[PDB]
Design a protein around this nucleic acid. Sequence first.
DNA 1: GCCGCGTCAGA
DNA 2: TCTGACGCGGC
Lengths: 101, 452, 1340, 14, 102
Amino acid sequence: IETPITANFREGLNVLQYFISTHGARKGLADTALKTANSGYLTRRLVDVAQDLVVTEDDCGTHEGIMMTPVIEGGDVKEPLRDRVLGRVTAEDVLKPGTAD
Amino acid sequence: VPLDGGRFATSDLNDLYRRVINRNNRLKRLLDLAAPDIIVRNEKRMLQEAVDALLDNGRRGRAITGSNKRPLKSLADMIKGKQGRFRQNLLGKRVDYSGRSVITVGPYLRLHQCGLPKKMALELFKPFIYGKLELRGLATTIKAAKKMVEREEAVVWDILDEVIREHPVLLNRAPTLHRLGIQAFEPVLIEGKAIQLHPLVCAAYNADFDGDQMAVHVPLTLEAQLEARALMMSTNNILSPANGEPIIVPSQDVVLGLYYMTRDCVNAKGEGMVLTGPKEAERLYRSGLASLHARVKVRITEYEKDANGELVAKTSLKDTTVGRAILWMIVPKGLPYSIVNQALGKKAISKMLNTCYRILGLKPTVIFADQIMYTGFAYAARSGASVGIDDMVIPEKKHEIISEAEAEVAEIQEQFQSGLVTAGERYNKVIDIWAAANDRVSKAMMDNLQTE
Amino acid sequence: YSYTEKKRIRKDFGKRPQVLDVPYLLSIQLDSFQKFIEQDPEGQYGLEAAFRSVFPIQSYSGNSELQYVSYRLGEPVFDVQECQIRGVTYSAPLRVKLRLVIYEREAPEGTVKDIKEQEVYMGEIPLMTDNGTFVINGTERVIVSQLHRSPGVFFDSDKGKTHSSGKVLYNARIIPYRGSWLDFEFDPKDNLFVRIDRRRKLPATIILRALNYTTEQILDLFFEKVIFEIRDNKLQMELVPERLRGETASFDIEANGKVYVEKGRRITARHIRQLEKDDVKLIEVPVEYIAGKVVAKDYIDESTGELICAANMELSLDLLAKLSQSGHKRIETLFTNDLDHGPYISETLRVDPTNDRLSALVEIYRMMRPGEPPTREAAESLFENLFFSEDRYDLSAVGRMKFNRSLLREEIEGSGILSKDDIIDVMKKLIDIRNGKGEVDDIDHLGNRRIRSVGEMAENQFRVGLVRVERAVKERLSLGDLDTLMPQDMINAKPISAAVKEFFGSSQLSQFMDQNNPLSEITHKRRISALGPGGLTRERAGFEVRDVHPTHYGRVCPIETPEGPNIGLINSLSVYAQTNEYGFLETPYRKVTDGVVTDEIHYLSAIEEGNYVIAQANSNLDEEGHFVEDLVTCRSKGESSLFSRDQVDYMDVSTQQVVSVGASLIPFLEHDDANRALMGANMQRQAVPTLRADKPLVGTGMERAVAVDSGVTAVAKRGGVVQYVDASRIVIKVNEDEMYPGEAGIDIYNLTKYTRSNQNTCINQMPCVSLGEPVERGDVLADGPSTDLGELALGQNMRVAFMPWNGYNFEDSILVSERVVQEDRFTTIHIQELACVSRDTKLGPEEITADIPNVGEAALSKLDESGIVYIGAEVTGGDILVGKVTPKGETQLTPEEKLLRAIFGEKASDVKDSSLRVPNGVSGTVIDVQVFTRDGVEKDKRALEIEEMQLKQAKKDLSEELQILEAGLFSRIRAVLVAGGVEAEKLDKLPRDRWLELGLTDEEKQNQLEQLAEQYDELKHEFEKKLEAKRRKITQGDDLAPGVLKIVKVYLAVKRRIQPGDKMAGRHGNKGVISKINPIEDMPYDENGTPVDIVLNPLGVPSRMNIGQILETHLGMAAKGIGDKINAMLKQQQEVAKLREFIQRAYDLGADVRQKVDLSTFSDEEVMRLAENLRKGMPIATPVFDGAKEAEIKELLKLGDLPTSGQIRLYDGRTGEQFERPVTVGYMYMLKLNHLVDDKMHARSTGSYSLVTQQPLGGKAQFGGQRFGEMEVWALEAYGAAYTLQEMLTVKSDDVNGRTKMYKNIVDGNHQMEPGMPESFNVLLKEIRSLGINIELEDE
Amino acid sequence: EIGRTTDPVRMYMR
Amino acid sequence: NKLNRISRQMLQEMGREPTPEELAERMLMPEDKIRKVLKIAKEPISMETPIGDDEDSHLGDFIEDTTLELPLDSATTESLRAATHDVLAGLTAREAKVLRMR
DNA sequence: GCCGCGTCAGA
DNA sequence: TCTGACGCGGC
Ligand SMILES: [Mg+2]
């Protein structure tokens, strides 16, 4: 609605304004309920499909690996390389801004 | 099996089976009579129907039972469950030696302890009691031990002491979000029926004190106890398994108390006194001869792990408040002053905790976290923060900006009616003027209030 | 003012005067059920209509009609009290005088044989209490109201999905009260298809074909023909200018000599007027144009007679030649202008290959019963009976009226069966909406949704009983010989009463009443459920109907509904709201005659409401209802804004009509968020009464009305002076005003004492007023549970302080002072019931005696020789109440045991123990014990003696009843008898009982003397049978279930004191558990030295948007400050005048109030008494919106002599140091919930297991284990904790050999494991093995 | 045309 | 069948209801037998019947098998047997074998 | 050959 | 309801 609830709880609202807010309140709680039961079921599906993955070996000896970037979504570097790479195994030695460093 | 009162209970399969045998015997008789083809086929129809309804009813005309309104439950139905297998999967595996009741706060407890109600443990740990009662010979046999547990004399408490010492116990909540929905704790007997939970970990359980219940399991063997204490213990899992960041992070009282203590002021009691050490500062504050928040110069030695975790004492002049100096006393010698040197909010506290873990290690952060909890509670209590009618400050120019926004929206609705403006343009105009006016009110209240 | 108001005034805030008084809130249920049981000779709703609807029962072609005259409800044989005692359903017999009248075979109509039945019994009908409840098993049940979608026609779209290209395809569903359903649906190519309900898809035209309509007849009755004249040759049309509605021209349209409309140029209004004024009928047109149209009728070739073009056949050039050579001057084409009149009936008719009525009936039958060869009469009877059978087809009077309303007919009532006009009008309006010349309806509209109360449901199931009874009766009417059988052989009441009692008990809407406070009861009674037959499903519906409709304004409360899977499906009725004539919803509104606002209230439905401009209550009215602004704030198209003054027809009666009673009671709702208001009210309804009722400091004025409508208060039904007050009897002497000349007597009000409520709680009434007070009819004599001073006193108001107390106020938990438990203000009484049952097995009759082998004499000591707990004895958990023994021999013990029996003298007693133990940890006093033996068996001595005690109790008490009213009677006979020539010497010494023969002067005196003498005769024979009757009920052996010899009921009374872990809340939705109870000394205190009670977390404030509680706290503290100062002047006892002055200044406090104060009432008695009552804090009435402004609160805070910021500096009671920043203290109204930690506590070590599955269960009465769910499994999986998991899933639950062996290991202190084969896995094997599938566990 | 009418009653009746 | 026809009749003659005694009265039977048949008259109600509100326990899911003796008493009997054998050891050779065989 | 329709089936 | 597999049926 174009005209808002201008008042605050310190001040006093009326009939109409309260009616407007009831919708959103009830709608919100009903969403949190039935869509959380939805999300729970979803989760159960993910856990159940992905169950078998366990660490069996120490190192197979793969040379393969993924080239990781800093996620630079528009305005800045929301998550930098260090944070993204923290705690990871490397595929090969990384060199400085100068070859063979 | 017979129900009490003369009544009987039977499976629907028994009645279906009975009809199956009846029709089969009739078919046998019908064979002996050399019955015509039409009727032999009808009997074979009825037999096929009955058999397939018996195995899985639902691919036929839905052949229910006599007068009982609910469709009969077939062999397939007994196996095929929702959700998942009847006896193996949910619902739901009931287990013995478990209890459930309301959780309660209990501020004085340490990180690795929990209040465990009397009557529950009395019932639960019955066999441990009986065994030690009879082995130590305090009770002649298990039967006499039973009468003596059911009276509940001084003797019971000693056996209780010995079991509860080396037992670790598990707390469980029904929304098992992640693995920390169950943690292992050392139980401490308290009066009452309420479970005491450590405050810091309430955030991890997403629990609130409005009648929520938790479950409590008993690992019985030695090995289970070991697995609980080693792998599942609360103190072992401070770090979130999801990200590296803290799970056992501050909840609310802590930050508030710290804020009271960490906040700086132009002027208070004892502005500009120069102290050779922290303890005199704190002595001055506790007497009310100095305020907790006042900019002050204090002589404090920060220590640094530069070596292999040794102390690298640098000894001179810091300019801080009283409050941060007192908290810095609690702070172990491995933290750089820099961390407490600033504003200290939820941001800074969590980063502090994190850095403490990475540089110092497990035990300092553990003990220090406990410390921070108690300190925060203390100074929160002394701060005396409340909520009055005047605490919600109506920004000075409120009704002006409101009346201006009202007159302009009315003008734009009337010029809507005039027909130079589409729906989109009108929507854009209304939403943007309301956004800018609302943001003005927000930022003006924040400006007005912040530096007042 | 009223008598209660004169007794206690409450200060009422408020600027506008509430003109209409609150209506009786339970009227809907009471009066509708009343309407059901009503001798009323017309087709109106209830028993009558139902009867005449199905009656008279005509013989199956035997010529013996059964006629119905009238019915009578007998007065129920068992009163309310006795029925509550024995667990009987309270009902009345209905007996009807019926006549079978028999004609002769084959007499021209004249019934020779007529037989009359002497009111056969057709079963018993459960009756409703004055409160609105029902006794079905000696327990109070309520029937929830059921909302449902009203009968009629609904035009829904459901676009998008309808072929996944938009394609806005509409449908009309016709839903009747009684009957099969109608569905009209479309197709992509615009053909209207019928689905009888959800079977195969046929063309809608086939039913009309069956209905006797030919294809051309249908094209007639749907499409309007166009006259095509042929002049000299070639094919011309007659065209009326207005008909060309939206049509690109295909030819050059010359008329009267000149080209008017160019071929292609859109016809403008100019062209229309041109043709109109030229007077153009007919225009020459090329045969090319006509070669594209369709031919309506079957135009024959006149020469031979042979048909060529058929009904709905395409027209082509050559056929145009064929027609013109045949000689038809006037050709009728159809008007189907595809924008307005689209290809609907034409294409539909083409797509339906069936032709005549018979083939239509054939395809109908072959769709309804596919594969059985159709027989004509079977198909016709089927199809006719589907929609035209009177008994089958009823839309309802409601449905029919709404139907005619939907199709814009003034005429209200139709004939129930589908008249063919209706059917065609339906398809007309459907294809109207399909072009778009109508609106689509919304399911959620109140005018489209009807409310079904008690009587309508009762009527439904009773009618179903009558239909099956008719099938049975008429079946027996045809075989058997008519003459000898009377109208009782045929009718068995058993299936009627069986099916009715099935409905009444076994239903969702019939539930156990929540009996904890009046709010819960009233809301339950006025609760509205969306389920049931003819009702919605929870999973099906749906975002659609759950959401809040604008029509609910002033009719339903938006904020009162359970917060469970049920939200939206409840919607309780608002305060001023009522049910309309047709069971719909209507709201009262004040007239506004253009400038003056009149006072008349009219109830308007939603349709009427849409029309008019109704003003809100929040507008200022001066001297005659005059509004200050020229452009005022109102709603007329269901949407609010500004309208000018010279337009307003109506106005809201008051703001409070929008919301129900519960939501209206919470103070300052305007400042409370809707979420927490809703949650607050929901939990608030579940609040339990404590020991001490007091009063809320901040009320609304409604608390008197709430108490008034509650049936737990006792109300004066005659008016007068209280003659005698007892804690069992309240006797009132009526004033001569209201005194019946014929049989008046005194008024006696018997009180209710600590009997068990549904929640097992206390329901006790205390008398409020004193002996000799003059009171009016309808005065509040004795207040019920948690009700005081006339008003509902739900809980208590305590001093709270907002501050953190070292993480004890952590999260939503509550810190509280020892002084609260110290006063015993939150200790509950719970009256729990236990039953001891002695059955008879074939092992031998069980006994209740004390002879119980090897039990301790501690447990025996409290038992009499009969084996009964002593009356009033206080026991503890585990203690034996009623002794019971059971036959048990042949132990078949293992060797060693036999050996030891020899050695020690272990004399085997052949009887097992059964005696009634008290449950674990529960301790209270026996208030009463009940014993029920079936007739036949030899009553025990103690049972006999206690039944004699109860006997003589009843005897004595009823005798007392009789003798007090008889003493009043006799006194009255003497006051009449001394009158008429005063003689008191002679009369006094003649005996009293020798006065029936007496007589005096002949007028009122002689007639009244004979009246009262016959009142004596009546009282004597009345009482003596009333006694005999009660001594028949007590004397009769009590009717027990098969197999149980005798039963003993025992009531335990537990006094349960508050402890840490109980659940407590305020009215605003803020809740919490008591974490620790601290001594008073610990808590901070004021400068004055009064210490605080509760410490509430300030961090609980900002996200919880209920701020009104703070205002309430301030006003409540200042209110007690008033009570303080008045108490102080009471303690000093200055003088009446100064306190009266101060109090008056309190009562007025400024102006703008609707208060209207004294000097009215007594100047000193009521004033000083009331003053004494007001020492505890003056009770105020803040209305929800027309309430006390903050400034007025500040003014009173000055009158309260307290800081305007409402904060005081506090000294810490532990340390003595003051706090920086002073805090807000004061009283807020708190409640302790029905969630008691005692019940929420449960644990199990070892116990009963399930029979088939070997997992733990609850049979010990020590409830069962936690469920280890898949979630918990996953938790264990996240750690590597394998041995714990394996124990928990198996060794702790399903392993039979293992748990016993491991038990022994635990006693021996051994800690290993032995998982074995889980029985669930064996279940798996056996289920597979039960099939023809082989599963073997291999090895390798 | 036979619409899966599983009812042995109908077939036998035929 | 006699029982239920009379049940029908007796309820319509009496109006209120048919008490068990009055039916036994009208018949030449020894009266004892109606209450017996009344006990026998309860029809088989299904063990698989779901509980009130159709929860995921049926009726069988309440009924417990009391036959299973608890591990407690088995421990008692174990302790008992050990004590008996120790007192057996107090006896002589053949006296022990006497009681051992008996 | 891909598209509604209709049956079957997990919550 | 929804997302979908596999025929089923039809075009
Ligand atoms: Mg909670």
